[PDB]
């Protein structure tokens, strides 16, 4: 009932930036917090950063706080993530996920999209 | 605001179980859901469970969803985290959070416990 589409995954150099994009349809109004998670090749799906729906207040893990900001808009029922001085251990496949209100965990996930970061 | 403290947790052998648990004090009324991460060697840390403090729901993500199981006991303070069926890739020191209402993210930590397979 609530639909999720990452966009802007792609290939970047070592110190460079790139933004991700997920759009949100169905009844967003019954979201609290939206968060970007990351799977690199082999590995676990790992948090990164959250923020709240209707708050735009922000968290973020130690491994990305200071180069990635999270950040909404209500209007365009968008999140993004900007990622500044990414590396190589950057590379993985990105999924934007929605948590409901009064719900608990992530109840609903996009496709993915891949980004990579070259030395 | 709120100080947690863990306890639990040690040398286990492959195929076995561990229990892990912690404590809350203080604005303990506050505190919207709970949850378990995990730090190797190294590594990042990496959300596990989480359980809602006042409605009891869980989640768990596909790396420990079927084996791992969440639980809280609201009146003695206290979360809990049983771990069944563990592999050595659960090798790990175990961190619990908790989430202030109307806040995000994980706001208090608790000082972590090791979980060695
Ligand atoms: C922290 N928090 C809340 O405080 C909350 C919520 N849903 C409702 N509320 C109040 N969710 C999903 C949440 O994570």
């Known amino acids: 009932q609530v639909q999720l589409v990452e966009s802007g995954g792609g290939l970047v150099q070592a110190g460079g930036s790139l933004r991700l994009s997920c759009?949100?349809?169905?009844?967003?109004?019954?979201?609290?917090?939206?968060?970007?998670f990351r799977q690199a090749p082999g590995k676990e799906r790992e948090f990164?950063?959250?923020?709240?729906?209707?708050?735009?207040?922000?968290?973020?893990?130690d491994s990305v706080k200071g180069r990635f900001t999270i950040s909404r808009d209500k209007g365009k029922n968008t999140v993004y993530l900007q990622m500044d001085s990414l590396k190589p251990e950057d590379t993985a496949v990105?999924?934007?996920?929605?948590?409901?209100?009064?719900?608990?965990?992530?109840?609903?996930?996009?496709?993915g999209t891949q980004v990579t970061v070259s030395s | 605001q709120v100080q947690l403290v863990e306890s639990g947790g040690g040398l286990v052998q492959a195929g076995g179980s561990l229990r892990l648990s912690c404590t809350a004090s203080?604005?303990?009324?506050?505190?919207?859901?709970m949850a378990w991460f995990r730090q190797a060697p190294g590594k990042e840390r990496e959300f596990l469970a989480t359980?809602?403090?006042?409605?009891?729901?869980?989640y768990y993500m596909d790396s420990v969803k079927g084996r791992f199981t969440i639980s809280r006991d609201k009146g003695k303070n206290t979360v809990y985290l049983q771990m069944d069926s563990l592999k050595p890739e659960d090798t790990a020191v175990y961190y619990c959070?908790?989430?202030?209402?109307?806040?995000?993210?994980?706001?208090?930590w608790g000082q972590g416990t090791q979980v060695t397979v």
């Open positions: 359980v809602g403090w006042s409605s009891g729901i869980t």
């Open positions: 959070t908790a989430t202030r209402a109307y806040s995000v993210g994980y706001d208090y």
């Open positions: 203080g604005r303990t009324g506050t505190i919207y859901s």
